[PDB]
Design a protein around this ligand. Structure first.
Ligand code: 8B0
Ligand code: 8B0
Ligand code: PLG
Ligand code: PLG
Ligand code: CL
Lengths: 442, 442
């Protein structure tokens, strides 16, 4: 007693918009550092009928029966997860049920400290995540600043994590968890030194590696598994999975953490797991452990170095003057334009990037930089040679952005009026669309 | 620089388990009251490339650009949601971003009350959800008991909501929110009287209608929209959508609530929306509003009434002696077997149901009933005439369960010893398989 008609027939209205979405993706230079493009196999898992099943609980400890094949998949996903991040199933456990990054962080923090518990993270404006305890004088913005008590540390004037300030703050504040691993941080993290500070104040070390997960897994960057009590990661960014998250806990370092983490996810926070997600994550974790994926991850870094270097050669300033990873943050101060203006201009030429604070910015009010990353364009086949064209496109956007601000004024409302119809943008947009639309597209 | 091979080639190990899962579903009499089967179109959206996109924020108030088609989809989903539940966009708003039912209840509750806020709900043992403030003397089991302060009401000896006890509690406890709508309640709710209790104590009326959403939408059961401040619902049960949730809030009764709810979902709790989920929900909400789906929902109730009637004709007791909706709870006391045993027996014959407490059960330790529902089998084309065979199959399961307990004993470990190789079960399984495997299967 159902309608078996395909999407085009059953909902022509929606299917056209989705077809448009597809076209915009195919025709965009996507520099969003947290975005990627899934392959067809991951999307087959996501549309699988496995999501019809209710599997509250854990493998072999389910509230309902008929979960034999579901258990096989959840167990397979955990095994692949632990292998991919080079950890022994005896020393490390993993939870694969969190629905997304934010949920996993909240659930994981709660497991370690509970309500009213004390946490330290990097300020949102310095490059930490919302779920790392972000708040405002005006409001407790994230639940992680409201269900917990949070202190926020900052990067120094050159954009680096200031460990001396972290220790100082940890010693007066006495937190139970200290979080590291970030949302817009262009360099590697010294986990060893974080561990040293945590030990000195008897705190958990929490590493959020969502942005760099592929680097940790492929032994290209520092390994936080050597020092962390908990490691969380999304599966949708550089990992190239579906939208989900993993939570890693070190059993050997903390007895009783497995139960704590596992009960925090269910039944403390979530109900039924989304089995299609878990299948898709399993699908991607097989690929992550291949030698071909290490090549892709290497290439992501090669492209990021090439991009930074080309941007520098065009006299564009980078926060920390470079990158160790997949992401760059441009300091736009010498051009006297805001990050928002450049976002609007790049939107108008089919280039996706976002505004991002820089150390000099007091607040997240008027961010003076943009953040770009290479995973999505590396997925689409661009190599180091192709990064010059992108740097060239960004430099032209910056120049137009300056000319438009000259002609219409600094106010954002005024500035946008300059954008529609502008001849240069139309020209630049077509170059973008012709070059972008040509590239391989899963 | 990606692998485009289909799931079967790229991950044969996973594709085999998923195919077994597909076979088990096709070959099962699924009486899980919370389960259903999605159509192909809903699964086309879930596997869509729209999930590639980061779109934190709300339509037209997005942190990133390139969100034009995403905004069209999120706005279309909210519009279709409001139409489906017979509310005007001027009086009611809805949030479509919650990743699941449990996230949506936590986010909604937090919006209304905040940390340390006081809430009332039905106890889990009496049929409430975990997210309605569930706790145990041993531990604060749900975050809704730990981040809020919660009191739990009970149903009466006949399995009905005892409003007089709810009032006694509401006046003594003085909560800010009172939750109604349940996970295993076989009758309709008197929202009018819940409203009366709420008004008396200045509490919000929260209606969780996930199990009954289709009935509310099609004007078959009482409408909580006439009285409730907030209404939440999953999209995956009787609504037949993807795994997601909706939060409805009433602007006209509470000004400033749209902001409170929207801020709770993001950035308080969630990060980026899962745009494939939103697309899938859009797709289903269209269908919900058709008169074909009203027929399906009618059929669900017809089948539930017919199943109840037949179970009674076979001398089987039902909590409240019947059902006003899609679900039945069997009281097994007269057969001297537990729900756990019957679940084990039904697992062995490819019948999916779950154990459930009854009013006489003080604890969740040994629940004395099972819960069954009709949405999934109604989806597969079962009509009233087909419920006799199901009632018959369940009666035979009960009898075998009784015979097995006689032969092997009351202890669960011993009882299971009796299940494999049992001649009767294999026979009963094969009929189940023959009849189930033939039914239409989206
Ligand atoms: C959207 C999002 N999600 N997670 C994030 C961010 C942003 C970010 C968040 C916010 C933000 C979001 C919700 C509530 C309050 C605020 C504030 N203030 C604002 C900005 C702004 F600078 F562009 F204004 C930037 C950026 C990657 C986009 C961010 C940064 N910087 C960090 N670190 O993490
Ligand atoms: C799984 C689940 N999710 N949401 C739910 C439930 C159950 C339920 C939950 C639990 C449960 C789950 C997590 C933590 C503690 C407990 C306890 N006690 C136990 C049982 C049992 F009674 F069968 F043992 C039943 C059932 C629909 C399966 C439930 C009922 N009855 C209600 N009302 O809501
Ligand atoms: C370090 C980190 N942790 C957790 C999350 C949460 O992911 P969800 O949105 O899946 O909840 C993000 C998202 N990062 C936002 C961005 O870089 O654009 C992140 O950067
Ligand atoms: C009334 C109600 N509310 C919320 C939820 C939570 O949904 P998620 O599992 O998507 O978190 C459930 C799940 N009910 C479980 C069942 O009836 O089988 C529910 O029954
Ligand atoms: Cl999904």
């Amino acid at each position: 007693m159902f309608n078996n008609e395909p999407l085009e027939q059953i909902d022509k209205e929606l299917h056209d918009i989705l077809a448009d979405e597809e076209k915009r993706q195919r025709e965009t230079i996507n520099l969003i550092a947290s975005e990627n493009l899934t392959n067809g196999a991951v999307r087959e898992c996501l549309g699988n009928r496995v999501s019809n099943k209710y599997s509250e609980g854990y493998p072999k400890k389910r509230y309902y029966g008929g979960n034999d094949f579901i258990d096989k998949i959840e167990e397979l996903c955990q095994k692949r997860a632990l292998e991919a991040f080079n950890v022994s199933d005896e020393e490390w456990g993993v939870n694969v049920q969190p629905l997304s990054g934010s949920a996993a962080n909240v659930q994981a923090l709660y497991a370690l400290v509970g309500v009213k518990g004390k946490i330290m993270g990097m300020h949102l404006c310095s490059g930490g995540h919302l779920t790392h305890g972000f708040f405002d004088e005006k409001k407790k913005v994230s639940i992680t600043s409201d269900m917990f008590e949070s202190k926020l540390y900052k990067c120094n004037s050159q954009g680096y994590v200031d460990l001396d300030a972290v220790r100082e703050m940890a010693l007066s504040f006495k937190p139970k968890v200290i979080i590291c691993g970030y949302t817009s941080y262009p360099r590697d993290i010294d986990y060893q030194q974080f561990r040293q500070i945590c030990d000195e104040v008897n705190a958990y070390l929490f590493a959020d590696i969502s942005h760099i997960s592929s680097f940790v897994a492929c032994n290209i960057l520092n390994n936080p598994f050597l020092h962390a009590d908990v490691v969380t990661t999304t599966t949708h960014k550089i990992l190239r999975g579906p939208r989900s998250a993993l939570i890693f806990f070190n059993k050997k370092r903390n007895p009783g953490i497995e139960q704590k983490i596992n009960s925090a996810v269910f039944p403390s926070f979530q109900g039924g797991p989304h089995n299609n997600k878990i299948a898709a994550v399993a699908c991607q974790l097989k690929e992550v452990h291949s030698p071909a994926f290490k090549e892709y991850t290497q290439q992501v870094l090669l492209n990021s170095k090439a991009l930074a270097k080309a941007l520098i050669s065009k006299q564009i300033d980078l926060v920390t003057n470079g990158t160790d990873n997949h992401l760059i943050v441009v300091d736009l101060r010498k051009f006297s334009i805001t990050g928002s203006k450049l976002q609007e201009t790049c939107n108008a030429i089919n280039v996706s990037l976002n505004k991002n604070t820089i150390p000099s910015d007091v607040d997240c009010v008027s961010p003076s930089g943009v953040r770009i990353g290479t995973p999505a364009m590396t997925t689409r086949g661009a190599k180091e040679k192709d990064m010059e064209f992108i740097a060239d496109v960004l430099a032209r956007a910056i120049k137009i952005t300056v000319d438009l601000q000259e002609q219409y004024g600094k106010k954002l409302v005024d500035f946008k009026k300059g954008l529609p119809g502008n001849a240069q943008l139309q020209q630049l947009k077509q170059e973008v669309v012709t070059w972008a639309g040509a590239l391989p597209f899963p």
